[PDB]
Amino acid sequence: HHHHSSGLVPRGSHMASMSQPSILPKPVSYTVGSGQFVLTKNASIFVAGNNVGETDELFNIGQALAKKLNASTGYTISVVKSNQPTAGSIYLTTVGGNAALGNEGYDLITTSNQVTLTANKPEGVFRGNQTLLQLLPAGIEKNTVVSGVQWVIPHSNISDKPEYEYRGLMLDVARHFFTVDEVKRQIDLASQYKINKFHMHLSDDQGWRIEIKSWPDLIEIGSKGQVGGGPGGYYTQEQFKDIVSYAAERYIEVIPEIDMPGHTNAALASYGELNPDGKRKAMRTDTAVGYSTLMPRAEITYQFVEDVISELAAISPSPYIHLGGDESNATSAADYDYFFGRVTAIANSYGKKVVGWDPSDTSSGATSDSVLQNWTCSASTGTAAKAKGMKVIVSPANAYLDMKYYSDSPIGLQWRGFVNTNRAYNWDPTDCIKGANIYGVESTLWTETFVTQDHLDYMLYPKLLSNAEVGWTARGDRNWDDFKERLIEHTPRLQNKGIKFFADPIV
Numbered sequence: 319h320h321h322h323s324s325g326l327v328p329r330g331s332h333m334a335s336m337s338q339p340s341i342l343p344k345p346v347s348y349t350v351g352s353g354q355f356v357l358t359k360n361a362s363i364f365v366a367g368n369n370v371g372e373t374d375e376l377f378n379i380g381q382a383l384a385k386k387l388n389a390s391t392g393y394t395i396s397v398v399k400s401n402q403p404t405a406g407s408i409y410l411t412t413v414g415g416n417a418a419l420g421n422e423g424y425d426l427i428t429t430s431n432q433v434t435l436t437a438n439k440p441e442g443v444f445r446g447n448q449t450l451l452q453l454l455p456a457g458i459e460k461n462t463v464v465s466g467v468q469w470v471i472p473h474s475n476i477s478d479k480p481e482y483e484y485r486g487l488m489l490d491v492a493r494h495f496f497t498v499d500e501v502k503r504q505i506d507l508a509s510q511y512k513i514n515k516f517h518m519h520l521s522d523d524q525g526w527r528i529e530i531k532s533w534p535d536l537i538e539i540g541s542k543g544q545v546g547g548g549p550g551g552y553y554t555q556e557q558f559k560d561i562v563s564y565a566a567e568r569y570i571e572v573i574p575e576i577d578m579p580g581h582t583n584a585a586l587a588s589y590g591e592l593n594p595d596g597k598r599k600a601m602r603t604d605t606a607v608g609y610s611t612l613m614p615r616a617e618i619t620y621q622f623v624e625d626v627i628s629e630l631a632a633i634s635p636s637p638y639i640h641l642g643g644d645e646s647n648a649t650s651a652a653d654y655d656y657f658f659g660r661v662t663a664i665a666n667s668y669g670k671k672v673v674g675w676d677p678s679d680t681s682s683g684a685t686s687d688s689v690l691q692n693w694t695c696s697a698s699t700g701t702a703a704k705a706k707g708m709k710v711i712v713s714p715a716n717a718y719l720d721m722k723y724y725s726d727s728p729i730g731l732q733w734r735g736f737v738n739t740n741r742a743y744n745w746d747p748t749d750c751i752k753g754a755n756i757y758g759v760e761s762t763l764w765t766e767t768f769v770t771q772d773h774l775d776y777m778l779y780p781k782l783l784s785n786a787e788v789g790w791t792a793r794g795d796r797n798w799d800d801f802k803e804r805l806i807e808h809t810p811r812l813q814n815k816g817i818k819f820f821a822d823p824i825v
């Protein structure tokens with residue numbers, strides 16, 4: 319047999335350039351039969367759970383769906399608590415879910431008279447709703463009313479569940495600041511592709527972005543800049559709670575990161591007492607990494623960390639806090655081991671499990687409940703994690719979405735090489751680490767060179783679609799030629815959402 323890899327498309331990107339569902343990520347099964355369902359102005363969404371509490375949760379999910387459908391159709395679809403759906407209805411139920419599909423799995427069966435989504439849990443109804451939106455015609459994704467499109471769904475049968483439990487996106491809001499609205503938008507867009515985790519990189523050398531009432535100068539001084547100089551910004555604790563709540567409506571866990579002991583210049587610029595000479599560091603607006611450190615043998619360091627963790631824990635319902643641990647090149651190995659162990663004890667005392675970048679798993683203070691975020695993806699990375707029974711989240715080069723698509727990309731870094739839409743697809747988590755308990759995947763969007771929402775869109779779309787499928791779709795069912803053609807077909811949907819995507823010439 320004959321095989322080949324993909325080159326660039328002759329005459330340019332199909333994303334330029336180019337009854338038809340566009341499901342991404344690819345579901346476990348999808349078959350189409352004869353006939354179609356028509357969504358009309360009289361349609362209702364019916365919801366029914368196994369008890370009144372569950373029905374109430376489904377009702378909220380139904381309302382979220384109704385809102386989305388209403389925006390593009392111009393209809394006023396309402397939600398009804400009843401297990402007796404009427405012809406032309408969408409029906410969302412957890413009664414009799416297939417347990418093998420797990421918390422996030424679902425069946426979605428469309429007949430001529432009815433759309434029925436059957437899941438084990440409300441979470442699965444939410445995920446299945448993302449597929450339902452992709453079964454309706456392009457135009458359904460519009461935020462304004464679309465005329466001249468019949469709102470049809472082919473008679474079809476879908477079953478689905480994720481391959482990995484953790485399918486995340488990290489946004490760096492330290493290097494450049496993004497508004498609550500901008501953050502909510504990225505969470506919303508990601509949710510449509512079954513991303514279920516959002517990691518906020520809230521602090522680094524160039525800025526500190528979370529209000530800490532016990533150390534107010536973290537904001538008064540530490541938030542006032544960013545890469546390239548200029549105003550910066552921050553989130554109040556109320557704003558952070560608002561982000562968490564918004565994510566929760568999409569069944570997205572928010573994991574906040576306070577990077578330590580490295581990547582700490584903004585803290586060091588805020589409080590002189592965190593420095594050996596007792597003086598504040600000057601703020602840094604460059605893009606160098608690795609140079610900064612907390613004082614690993616000063617008790618004030620651990621008091622500071624405890625105050626930050628106490629306040630963050632109080633406002634962050636996730637059982638996880640990310641404490642960073644990358645590129646502590648001004649911290650000795652001995653001090654790093656000691657420091658990371660001490661801060662893990664603090665986090666645990668406030669009821670939080672610790673996530674950390676490699677090599678944080680090597681800390682003698684880690685527990686089997688700690689999580690390794692494996693970004694290095696070398697043969698030796700996560701040796702400690704594996705021996706300790708720690709879950710691993712992988713973030714290989716293929717998941718570093720801040721990398722340029724190509725040598726000539728106008729934004730992005732390139733220290734992990736270039737990552738086009740194909741590279742973002744053609745990998746497997748088991749490539750990064752062998753013999754581990756792989757919790758899942760996280761796409762990291764560092765922001766050294768991204769200033770505007772358009773920059774975020776350009777780099778995340780279509781790259782994040784590739785990573786999302788790697789997290790959701792089983793390896794045996796992943797195929798670039800398949801995904802590429804599906805992505806071409808999906809393009810109008812990106813346009814309709816107002817995503818300022820890159821029309822990748824390999825698509």
Ligand SMILES: CC(=O)N[C@@H]1[C@@H](O)[C@H](O)[C@@H](CO)O[C@H]1O
Pocket residue numbers: 581607644645675693718720731764765766
């Ligand atoms: C864990 C990690 O990635 N650390 C740094 C991060 O601060 C930087 O923004 C990113 C840019 O790609 O490169 C990394 O080396």
